[PDB]
Structure 1
Amino acid sequence: PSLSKEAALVHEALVARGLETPLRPPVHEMDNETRKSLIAGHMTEIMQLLNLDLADDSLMETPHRIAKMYVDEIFSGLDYANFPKITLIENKMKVDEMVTVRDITLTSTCESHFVTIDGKATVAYIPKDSVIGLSKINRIVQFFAQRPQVQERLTQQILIALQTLLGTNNVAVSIDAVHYCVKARGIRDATSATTTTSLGGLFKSSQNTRHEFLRAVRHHN
């Protein structure tokens, strides 16, 4: 069993741009179940170096959990077998204005500290010959979010991907997020948020389409 068509096209598009999250050739396909078990073991070791009575009934299953989380959960975006099934319909309606999906739930991790990134994404595109099923947008945002990320790069990966799938450069992405690596640690700023945006096609070149999008960005409820 091997990958999908849309998946391939995207992946290549990001590679051709140096936007792919830093990875090393898989070499051999290590039995996934065996991958966790090894990691879980490593976690055990760290927790011990922290003097954590594993004999207890609560922390006992954590080493396992953390492994299952990294392997089959918050980093799934790393594997393209998880790329969402994409579907498009003929732009019969001749939609020549932008379609915007705002306040998309975006959950991620800052690759620097492996800590929570809680945010919101706002995506918009102007249909060329295809209108994409709304959910696919969300699904595409959450795919790239589930990986060790750098907001700036995440935003970018979302753009090129939508552009590749929709068949248009007229796509704009915008992520607004709270970094817990900045919040629950270090400088510990509890109020600040980070906003990153990637503007394609007209959203970049057209001064009209640009400010139409940015103006409708950053909403609450």
Structure 2
Amino acid sequence: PSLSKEAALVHEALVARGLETPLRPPVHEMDNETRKSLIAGHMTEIMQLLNLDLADDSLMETPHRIAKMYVDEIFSGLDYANFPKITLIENKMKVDEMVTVRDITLTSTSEHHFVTIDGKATVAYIPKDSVIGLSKINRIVQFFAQRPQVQERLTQQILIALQTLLGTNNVAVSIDAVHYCVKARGIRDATSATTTTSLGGLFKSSQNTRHEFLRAVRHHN
């Protein structure tokens, strides 16, 4: 009727663990269209406060572009209606070893300064009853990435979403990323990168499994 069974499931799971992004229920039944126009209005004000000449052919549409970007693009992960369609195939192949999807492109936004987070994620899991379609892992990652994030939370969320959908605790997520709110300003450290990992099931319990995954993490380009 709105949210898919999966979307609902993942959402509840996150809420239960207290890992959901801080959200207040939709204050009023607003069309994304009205929300965008309102956001655009505020951007117009802010741009004017910065003394930008909004009459300039280029600058003129920026409040619109920004409103659209926030609502439809970069923060679309906040709406579970945008949760990807998950397809799982029966594990007839009897795969009992981990499947690793490495170097998943991940672009997020830091909630602290609303500045770009560019990184790559490495997800691995040991198939139980079903094998998830490869692209879905990338889609789920991008879903949670499209929200004002805190890398530490993002990793946790991805882990739970997967554990929930795959029906196994044997999931591990590692994210390596560069925060422009560290690089582009403030301390302006042009070289540092942050790495966060959340291990589930055997990936935490079994040191054998755990290290196999960790060893596999990080691959240049």
| TM-score (norm: length of structure 2) | 0.99
Which deviations, in whole Å up to 9, do the C-alpha atoms of 1:15-69 show, x marking residues without a partner? 0011100000114220110110011010000011110011110100001110000
Which deviations, in whole Å up to 9, do the C-alpha atoms of 1:90-143 show, x marking residues without a partner? 100110000000000000000000000000000000000000000000000000
| Aligned counterparts of 1:29 and 1:176: Cα–Cα separation in 2 | 38
Shift >4 Å, 4+ stretches: none
Residue aligning to 1:124: 124
Which deviations, in whole Å up to 9, do the C-alpha atoms of 1:130-187 show, x marking residues without a partner? 0000000000000000000000000000000000000000000000000000000100
Structure 2 gaps of 5+ residues are: none
| Aligned counterparts of 1:3 and 1:140: Cα–Cα separation in 2 | 15
How many residues align? The count is 221
| Aligned counterparts of 2:33 and 2:6: Cα–Cα separation in 1 | 27
Residue aligning to 1:11: 11
| Aligned counterparts of 2:220 and 2:131: Cα–Cα separation in 1 | 26
Q: Is residue 158 of structure 2 the alignment partner of residue 158 of structure 1?
A: yes
| Aligned counterparts of 1:14 and 1:138: Cα–Cα separation in 2 | 19
User: What's the secondary structure of 2:17's corresponding residue?
Assistant: coil
| Aligned counterparts of 1:36 and 1:132: Cα–Cα separation in 2 | 35
User: What's the secondary structure of 1:196's corresponding residue?
Assistant: strand
User: What's the secondary structure of 1:64's corresponding residue?
Assistant: helix
Greater CA drift, 144-153 or 28-37: 28-37
Which deviations, in whole Å up to 9, do the C-alpha atoms of 1:184-213 show, x marking residues without a partner? 010000000000000000000001000000
In angstroms, what is the RMSD of aligned CA positions? 0.6
| Aligned counterparts of 2:102 and 2:3: Cα–Cα separation in 1 | 30
| Aligned counterparts of 2:140 and 2:36: Cα–Cα separation in 1 | 26
User: What's the secondary structure of 1:16's corresponding residue?
Assistant: helix
| Aligned counterparts of 1:150 and 1:129: Cα–Cα separation in 2 | 32
| Aligned counterparts of 2:59 and 2:26: Cα–Cα separation in 1 | 32
Greater CA drift, 28-37 or 112-121: 28-37
Query: What is the identity percentage for the equivalent residue pairs of Structure 1 and Structure 2?
Result: 99
User: What's the secondary structure of 2:157's corresponding residue?
Assistant: helix
Greater CA drift, 169-178 or 21-30: 21-30
Structure 1 position 7, deviation (Å): 0.5
| Aligned counterparts of 2:92 and 2:216: Cα–Cα separation in 1 | 26
| Aligned counterparts of 2:37 and 2:176: Cα–Cα separation in 1 | 35
Residue aligning to 1:113: 113
| Aligned counterparts of 1:205 and 1:4: Cα–Cα separation in 2 | 32
| Aligned counterparts of 1:27 and 1:147: Cα–Cα separation in 2 | 19
